[PDB]
């Protein structure tokens, strides 16, 4: 059902971009639009897109708009899979990245909370300390020697481990590894650390930076010593360094009340720090 409701949001969005995106008549820019975008991207075949938010917010009265904004991390997979669907339909090596822009609102970095977590948002600030571009897995072929490698999948969320199932064989496991660097897909990336805009900061609170990671062809778009405007893909990164913070800090101690006694305790603290992410980067300002 949650699968079904989410999938419904899929079909609704896919219908959106396939349904008319443009009301402009006579002289134009007459319809469509986004088809023209898929095709203009098919011109140089660089496989990433730009689609505006405002339209999408207006069309459905926003039920879809809000459905995207609030649960957006939930709704990534359905969306890029939907784009893949339409591409498969009208178009003939698959890497896709979808980035909205032109949000209705701007939020200061100091105005960031955890209620907007996992949800797309807009943040503008002064970029600082860009960092050289390094590859990333997210698709890897890794298995043991026994009995065969070339299994390619998973490592989706940042972990980075490991193969999910159907080990070894026949040694079936558990186990772990081994990872190939000869077979996998990589993308990007460069990290940049963005600072609060000099003019804004509340007295005397003094500026506080946050960290924004750049994946996508959005790479290198950022510039050191410049004001920029980002759109959300917001998320979280875990942090070891918070101890003696003070607490009270939550933990992972597992519930073993199943099974029976005849692994140990297995406790891992979970302490996260907010760090923004970016699909879209503009130099506006």
């Amino acid at each position: 059902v949650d699968d079904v409701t989410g999938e419904k949001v899929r079909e609704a969005f896919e219908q959106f971009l396939e349904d008319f995106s443009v009301q402009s008549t006579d002289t134009g820019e007459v319809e469509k639009v986004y088809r023209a975008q898929i095709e203009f991207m098919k011109i140089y075949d660089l496989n990433t897109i730009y689609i505006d938010y405002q339209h999408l917010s207006m069309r459905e009265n926003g039920a879809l708009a809000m459905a995207i904004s609030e649960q957006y991390y939930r709704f990534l997979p359905f969306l890029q899979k939907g784009l893949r669907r339409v591409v498969r339909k009208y178009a003939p090596e698959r890497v896709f990245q979808i980035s909205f822009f032109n949000l209705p609102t701007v939020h200061r970095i100091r105005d960031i909370r955890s209620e907007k977590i996992g949800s797309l948002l807009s943040i503008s600030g002064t970029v600082t300390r860009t960092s050289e571009v390094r590859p990333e897995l997210y698709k890897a072929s890794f298995t043991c020697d026994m009995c065969r490698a070339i299994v390619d999948n998973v490592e989706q969320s940042f972990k980075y481990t490991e193969p999910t199932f159907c080990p070894n064989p026949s040694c079936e496991n558990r186990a772990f590894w081994t990872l190939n660097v000869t077979r996998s897909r990589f993308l990007d990336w460069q990290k940049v650390r963005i600072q609060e805009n000099a003019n804004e900061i509340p007295t005397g609170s003094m500026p506080r930076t946050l960290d924004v990671i750049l994946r996508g062809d959005s790479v290198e778009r950022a510039k050191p010593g410049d004001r920029c405007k980002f759109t959300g893909v917001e998320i979280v990164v875990p942090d070891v360094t918070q101890l003696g913070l003070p607490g009270v800090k939550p933990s992972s101690t597992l519930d073993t009340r199943g099974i029976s006694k005849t692994r140990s305790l297995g406790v891992r603290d979970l302490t996260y720090k907010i760090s923004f992410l970016a699909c879209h980067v503009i130099s506006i300002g």
Binding site: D2, Y73, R74, R108, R110, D111, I112, R113, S114, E115, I117, G118, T126, T128, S157, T164, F165, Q195, A198, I201, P202, T203, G204, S205, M206, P207, R208, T209, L210, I235, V236, P238, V240, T241, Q242, L243, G244, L245, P246, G247, V248, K249, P250, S251, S252, T253, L254, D255, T256, G258, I259, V267, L270, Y272, K273, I274
Partner: protein
Amino acid sequence: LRIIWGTNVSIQECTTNFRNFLMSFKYKFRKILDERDEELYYIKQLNEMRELGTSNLNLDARNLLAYKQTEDLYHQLLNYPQEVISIMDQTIKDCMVSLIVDNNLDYDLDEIETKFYKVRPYNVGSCKGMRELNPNDIDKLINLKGLVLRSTPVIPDMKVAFFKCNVCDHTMAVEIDRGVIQEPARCERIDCNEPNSMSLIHNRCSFADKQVIKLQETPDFVPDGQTPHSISLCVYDELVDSCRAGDRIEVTGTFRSIPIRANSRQRVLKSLYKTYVDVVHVKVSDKRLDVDTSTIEQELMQNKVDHNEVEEVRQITDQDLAKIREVAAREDLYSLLARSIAPSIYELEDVKKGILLQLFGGTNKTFTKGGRYRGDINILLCGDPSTSKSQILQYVHKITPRGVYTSGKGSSAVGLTAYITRDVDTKQLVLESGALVLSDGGVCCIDEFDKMSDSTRSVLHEVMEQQTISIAKAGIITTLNARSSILASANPIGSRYNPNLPVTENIDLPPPLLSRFDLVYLVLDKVDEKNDRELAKHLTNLYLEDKPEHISQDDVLPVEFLTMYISYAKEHIHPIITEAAKTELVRAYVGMRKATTRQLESMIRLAEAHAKMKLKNVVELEDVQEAVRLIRSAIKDYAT
């Protein structure tokens, strides 16, 4: 009679006990106040609550003490704060619903009742510091005070955890409640069985916000040998960011004790528990000390409305307003307030007065962009020693909300901004606000300004002009805003500055910096005979009473009235000089030129303070007269 295991607080029957109170109170507080408003507070105020729907009924504590019943519940709240606060929350919710069913259809309709109502008790007890506290009180409501050094960014904290499966996959999630997240080993869908790894996806889980505010407390009443301690309080939820760095704050909250892992690898805990405050309630504004400006607050008005909140800007009743607008009529007002500022301090009225305008100083202007001349007016004063020149500093320091007080030579250009210290709690590098950055807004006070090292004062040529400071050093490179008045004390070389000699020479200083100060006071003793007798009559009093009373008496003086007055004047007035001024205004400047252009800037700012007072949106052609005379006042003192 039930019970709670350790609390001796019987569930319910304290709810009855609390309700008879809540519904019926009025004022018994005045029996402690001794009397010398009629109807009860809480039903009215709780109504205001219900229409506004701000939630956050902050109670008082003590309204309870002294009233019967609840004579007991006060004790039970000071001792067992958390549980009791939960009870009270429930009670208030039920009291809401029961209040609605009287009026039938309310607020369309039944939703608002289910919304969470919570208490933020304050004003609890007179406590001694932090340091004084025993391990005997681990969890209790406790009061603190003192400026805020720094605040960390928001740290996210779990509320509802989230989980997915490798198989099938299924999405269910376990809520935290008590402080651990216990995940099921296996499994949902399949189930089965099967011992398949249960993934924890941390972007789908729900968080709340935990910030941490470092605090430098002043308990006063210092037992010695103690030196100022530092504290760390973790706020929560809505209270996040509701406190700027540098404020003087009254915060109340529950004392706390938690261990912190030593190894960071092993499970081991360090024993020797580390302690901190949980800060249930914050009490930013004060009656006794002056109120912050609006322009500076800005966003925290434009924000903090949306998620709502409580307190912040000091609020004024109606009839007292009706008293202010009456007092404004009084003709001797400009004189009157001047005597009221420093009650102990005798004569020297024009100093009191110039400073009086330092409190009202200027009018802020953004143009289209840039601009920003603020209201800032800056005052040096020099003279023979023992002239009270330091006392004023103390007093202004006491009134001005955000100001900071620095001695000469106890200062350095690094000390006045951007320390970039190691945090030592997290073993990280964190930025600290310097002394001028804190002092942003209100008034920085300076001792022995003449005596500053040569590298220092090189900070001020930045501030006085730009009104911001530009820090390109070390880690972070930015121009950050400090908008602040300066009141500087100076001792001439003499130290009696003596007749003749060039005075402009005899203040020392580079003359360019010296010309920059808005209004420069030179105080002198003409040995009036005929004075010292009068002055001795003033000071040699007290004497009586030993318990200080009737200081300047018999003299008509405002006390707490002048602060709400000054505040009111500042937020609700924005004077413009229009046409009338410019002629005389200019001819003054020329008359001085016949000095530097700054003196003009000075006049137009200083004067607009006068006009800011008296509640005039427009300057008179008059009132620029004394506004000059104040600059000429020192000249009648430059004759020798």
